[PDB]
């Protein structure tokens, strides 16, 4: 019911950036390929830019090199 981008940004406390990204026609698939310069060009500030970029990198590393299944205790 919610988009991959909406949930992605929600997990990072960055829901308020969903409007800007959708306005610039950027879905999650497109965001994965965004460089620092790309996000600079669409007025994403330093702090938010580094949070997104870090999360993209962690996502890519998990998808490309998935570990053993482990339980997270909550």
């Amino acid at each position: 019911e919610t988009s991959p981008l909406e949930t992605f940004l929600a997990s990072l406390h960055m829901e308020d950036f969903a409007a800007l990204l959708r306005q610039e026609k950027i879905d999650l698939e497109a965001l994965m390929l965004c460089s620092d310069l790309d996000l600079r060009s669409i007025s994403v500030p330093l702090g938010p830019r580094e949070k997104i970029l870090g999360a993209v990198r962690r996502r890519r590393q998990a998808m490309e090199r998935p570990p053993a299944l482990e339980d997270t205790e909550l």
Binding site: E1, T2, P4, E6, T7, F8, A10, S11, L12, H13, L28, A55, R58, R59, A62, M63, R65, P66, P67, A68, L69, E70, D71, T72, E73, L74
Partner: protein, 192 residues
């Protein structure tokens, strides 16, 4: 009626199982059950082919084949599933936490499953179960989420709402090179 029942059942088998050797095994254990009337042995033998979530509707397909006098026991021995979603509200600031463990995510090719419950804990008290699949967190779909994103999403607010679907299977992958397999709740809990 038995040619109509066989026809409808065969359609369900063909749709959920691709492999012919797996089909042959399925029909064989059902043939054996008709001879012996051993429902416990049947359910145990059925597990070899019903080995992943997408194959669980086979239990529903088989139920009409089970005589009335065995349908209560059959239900008890098979996972209790429902397409109606269960919603719960949990407090993260609780002194003893949520009282559950969680595994899975997009990087594993599987959904998010409750793998452990602390008996008497907060998750337990609201009726959550080992074998439950989490389909929604704080209103958000998690079908495109990695394990870490789901964990971070749970930890965003002081409280968390979880929507749940009971499956009765737990995903298993003991190393980065292992394939994804599934274990029934009873096996996973006993082996832990």
């Amino acid at each position: 009626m038995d040619r109509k029942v066989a026809r409808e059942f065969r359609h369900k088998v063909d749709f959920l199982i691709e492999n012919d050797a797996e089909k042959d095994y399925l029909y064989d254990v059902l043939r054996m059950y008709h001879q012996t009337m051993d429902v416990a042995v049947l359910v145990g033998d059925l597990k070899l082919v019903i080995n992943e979530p997408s194959r669980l509707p086979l239990f529903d397909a088989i139920r009409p084949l089970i005589p009335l006098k065995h349908q209560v026991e059959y239900d008890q021995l098979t996972p209790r599933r429902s397409r109606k979603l269960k919603e719960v509200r949990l407090d993260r600031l609780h002194p003893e936490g949520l009282g559950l463990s969680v595994r899975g995510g997009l990087e594993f090719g599987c959904g998010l499953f409750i793998s452990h419950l602390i008996k008497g804990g907060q998750a337990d008290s609201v009726g959550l179960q080992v074998g439950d699949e989490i389909v929604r967190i704080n209103g958000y779909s998690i079908s495109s989420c990695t394990h870490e994103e789901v964990i971070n999403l749970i930890r965003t607010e002081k409280t968390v709402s979880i929507k749940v679907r009971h499956i009765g299977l737990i995903p298993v992958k003991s190393s980065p090179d292992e394939p994804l397999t599934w274990q029934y709740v009873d096996q996973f809990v006993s082996e832990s």
